[PDB]
């Protein structure tokens, strides 16, 4: 049918660690794509630099700025939808802010607007090294795991610099740098405006968080979590798919650096943006790009049928 049959095309937007496919096999949008052009919709896989910035010659914004111009060509459109998950939420932004003629709507799915907690972790571990060879070492591994799983074997990755761009001090620049009417105040846990005017140009801004992982219980100043997605314990998906536990060990370093509920590496605070759809999701990072290969807990929400209906609602506003 044409259920997700969207005026402007759509790119899915990849973050951290990401391609198009991971050595050129596994997609990062887990089965979405295929799911979205069955329902009609006209939607393109951005493929960009794993690890990068957003900003900056060589960033992630000017290869999505690139890759949108290439799909207006293709298509003959005039503006495209761009669906971001996590670090690709803020390249998505830095297109939407840097050319608002070419974009019809900005939508972040488990998005650092605010930076993550589990960045500013792993930035201090590094510092604790105190020949620094650790950054070196660590930094090439990293961006050559990059290189090799790229789609495109592309050698442009820089894991330094995104890790320095995921902390929240940085994100807090980055905001700054590159304003939304879509971002609330920061320290306020608030999200903006539901849209974005310049000029002629308005942009729908939506978002939406996964809350799997929650603070539960605290005991001699260390806070305890529970992820939520899963039955306890006995859940299949703590065996079929390693982020499982992975994100709830990563999501309770956040809990004990005070972000609250979060997804596993992103708090809810930190994800909201424009019209806030939902942050109840009962998903961690993964789950919200179907991953890894469909597995999800058993209380979480199918993400598939969000992001589908999510086409659906930007065809009903015209977009
Ligand atoms: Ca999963």
Same mark, same amino acid.
Not at 41 to 55: E, K, M, P, R, W
Not at 128 to 146: E, H, K, M, Q, R
Not at 267 to 273: F, G, M, T, V
């Given at each position: 049918?044409?259920?997700?049959?969207?005026?402007?095309?759509?790119? *899915?937007?990849?973050?951290?660690?990401?391609?198009?496919?991971?050595?050129?096999?596994?997609?990062?949008?887990?089965?979405?794509?295929?799911?979205?052009?069955?329902?009609?919709?006209?939607?393109?896989?951005?493929?960009?630099?794993?690890?990068?910035?957003?900003?900056?010659?060589?960033?992630? %914004?000017?290869?999505?700025?690139?890759?949108?111009?290439?799909?207006?060509?293709?298509?003959?459109?005039?503006?495209?939808?761009?669906?971001?998950?996590?670090?690709?939420?803020?390249?998505?932004?830095?297109?939407?802010?840097?050319?608002?003629? *070419?974009?019809?709507?900005?939508?972040?799915?488990?998005?650092?607007?605010?930076?993550?907690?589990?960045?500013?972790?792993?930035?201090?571990?590094?510092?604790?090294?105190?020949?620094?060879?650790?950054?070196?070492?660590?930094?090439?591994?990293?961006?050559?795991?990059?290189?090799?799983?790229?789609?495109?074997?592309?050698?442009?990755?820089?894991?330094?610099?995104?890790?320095?761009?995921?902390?929240?001090?940085?994100?807090?620049?980055?905001?700054?740098?590159?304003?939304?009417? %879509? *971002?609330?105040?920061?320290?306020?846990?608030?999200?903006?405006?539901?849209?974005?005017?310049?000029?002629?140009?308005?942009?729908?801004?939506?978002?939406?968080?996964?809350?799997?992982?929650?603070?539960?219980?605290?005991?001699?100043?260390?806070?305890?979590?529970?992820?939520?997605?899963?039955?306890?314990?006995?859940?299949?998906?703590?065996?079929?798919?390693?982020?499982?536990?992975? *994100?709830?060990?990563?999501?309770?370093?956040?809990?004990?650096?005070?972000?609250?509920?979060?997804?596993?590496?992103?708090?809810?605070?930190?994800?909201?943006?424009?019209?806030?759809?939902?942050?109840?999701?009962?998903?961690?990072?993964?789950?919200?790009?179907?991953?890894?290969?469909?597995?999800?807990?058993?209380?979480?929400?199918?993400?598939?049928?969000?992001?589908?209906?999510?086409?659906?609602?930007?065809?009903?506003?015209?977009?």
């Amino acid at each position: 049918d044409n259920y997700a049959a969207t005026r402007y095309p759509i790119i *899915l937007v990849h973050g951290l660690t990401g391609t198009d496919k991971y050595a050129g096999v596994l997609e990062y949008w887990y089965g979405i794509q295929e799911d979205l052009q069955q329902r009609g919709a006209t939607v393109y896989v951005a493929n960009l630099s794993g690890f990068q910035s957003d900003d900056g010659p060589n960033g992630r %914004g000017e290869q999505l700025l690139a890759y949108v111009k290439t799909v207006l060509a293709a298509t003959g459109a005039t503006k495209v939808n761009l669906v971001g998950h996590s670090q690709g939420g803020l390249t998505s932004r830095y297109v939407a802010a840097v050319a608002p003629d *070419l974009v019809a709507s900005v939508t972040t799915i488990g998005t650092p607007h605010r930076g993550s907690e589990f960045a500013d972790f792993v930035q201090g571990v590094l510092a604790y090294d105190p020949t620094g060879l650790s950054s070196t070492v660590i930094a090439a591994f990293v961006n050559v795991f990059g290189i090799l799983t790229s789609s495109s074997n592309n050698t442009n990755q820089d894991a330094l610099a995104a890790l320095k761009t995921l902390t929240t001090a940085q994100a807090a620049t980055y905001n700054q740098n590159y304003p939304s009417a %879509g *971002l609330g105040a920061p320290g306020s846990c608030q999200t903006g405006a539901p849209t974005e005017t310049v000029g002629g140009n308005t942009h729908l801004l939506y978002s939406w968080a996964g809350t799997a992982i929650q603070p539960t219980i605290s005991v001699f100043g260390v806070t305890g979590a529970t992820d939520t997605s899963t039955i306890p314990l006995v859940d299949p998906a703590n065996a079929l798919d390693p982020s499982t536990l992975a *994100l709830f060990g990563t999501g309770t370093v956040m809990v004990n650096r005070g972000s609250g509920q979060n997804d596993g590496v992103v708090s809810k605070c930190s994800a909201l943006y424009g019209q806030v759809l939902s942050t109840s999701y009962k998903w961690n990072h993964l789950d919200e790009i179907n991953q890894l290969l469909g597995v999800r807990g058993a209380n979480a929400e199918d993400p598939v049928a969000v992001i589908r209906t999510h086409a659906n609602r930007l065809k009903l506003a015209g977009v």
